[PDB]
Amino acid sequence: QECSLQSCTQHQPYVVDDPCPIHFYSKWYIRVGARKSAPLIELCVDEASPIQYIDIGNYTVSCLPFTINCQEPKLGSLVVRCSFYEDFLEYHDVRVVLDFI
Amino acid sequence: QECSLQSCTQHQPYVVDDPCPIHFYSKWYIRVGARKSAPLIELCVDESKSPIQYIDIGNYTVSCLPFTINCQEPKLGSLVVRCSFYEDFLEYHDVRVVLDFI
Ligand code: NA
Numbered sequence: 001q002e003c004s005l006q007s008c009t010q011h012q013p014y015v016v017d018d019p020c021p022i023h024f025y026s027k028w029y030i031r032v033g034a035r036k037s038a039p040l041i042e043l044c045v046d047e048a049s050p051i052q053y054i055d056i057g058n059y060t061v062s063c064l065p066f067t068i069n070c071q072e073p074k075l076g077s078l079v080v081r082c083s084f085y086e087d088f089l090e091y092h093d094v095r096v097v098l099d100f101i
Numbered sequence: 102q103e104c105s106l107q108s109c110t111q112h113q114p115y116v117v118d119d120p121c122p123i124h125f126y127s128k129w130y131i132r133v134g135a136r137k138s139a140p141l142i143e144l145c146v147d148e149s150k151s152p153i154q155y156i157d158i159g160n161y162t163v164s165c166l167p168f169t170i171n172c173q174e175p176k177l178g179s180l181v182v183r184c185s186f187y188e189d190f191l192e193y194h195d196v197r198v199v200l201d202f203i
Binding site: 002007031033034035036037077095097098099100101 | 137197
């Protein structure tokens with residue numbers, strides 16, 4: 001149950017500081033409604049993992065590095081999943097929250 | 102200790118776990134728009150005349166003893182607790198409280 005508080009300028013691009021340990025693999029998600037029993041929507045799916053989610057709005061500026069238009073997401077919470085192994089069977093989640101300058 | 106992630110059932114009262122260290126005094130605030138340069142609105146202070154005044158239409162603050170909220174993110178801004186060792190709150194650190202919903 002870790003939290004990552006970061007600061008950026010509202011409505012401007014912000015390269016999100018990845019709070020996963022170094023050399024961990026990370027996947028970025030929206031947790032719908034910030035409800036833990038709700039779906040985790042994966043962001044920045046290149047193709048195909050199985051479902052690609054595209055955003056109507058401008059939340060995502062870039063997927064490399066993961067860069068957002070500095071704002072709190074309304075659909076749910078911004079969560080990063082950290083895993084040492086590529087299969088992601090053992091992992092930990094960190095929620096990312098913004099203070100605005 | 103800058104962020105405190107907590108879990109509750111949405112739209113039901115939640116006694117907020119105070120994340121200040123033990124023996125510290127705590128005051129609860131909304132930071133308007135979560136903007137560091139914006140006003141801090143103190144909760145559980147309800148004493149008057151002023152051109153801008155803040156009301157709680159949805160009973161976001163359920164109780165001030167213990168500090169208990171309607172389990173929700175306040176739209177006006179972020180929930181912040183100011184922790185101070187001294188009663189004068191001259192030396193302090195703020196902790197933002199964030200909710201995951203059950
Ligand atoms: Na929320």
